[PDB]
Amino acid sequence: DFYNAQKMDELTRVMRKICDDNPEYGEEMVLRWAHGLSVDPGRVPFLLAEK
Amino acid sequence: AANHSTTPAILSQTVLDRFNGALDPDPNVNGAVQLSMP
């Protein structure tokens, strides 16, 4: 302990970006990411253009 | 699904994002390590 931690600090920060870079599936893909699972792609919307 | 009217606009930058703050820091980052003391 403090050796299993000091990467938990590193490991929780990468967990923050996977649920932030993809706001949809957020707070659930991190759950699946830890176990090595993936979300179904077709449900989510996506953006076409911005002006 | 019950909305039936136009919605308000969306900000281009939140106050927290502007100052890169956080409402509640996590307890794991710079966190606590268990101590044995029986």
């Binding site: 403090f2 600090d9 | 710079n30 966190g31 606590a32 390590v33 101590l35 003391m37």
Partner: peptide, 7 residues
């Protein structure tokens, strides 16, 4: 039940 904390 205590902790020396990492900081």
């Amino acid at each position: 039940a205590g902790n020396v904390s990492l900081t």
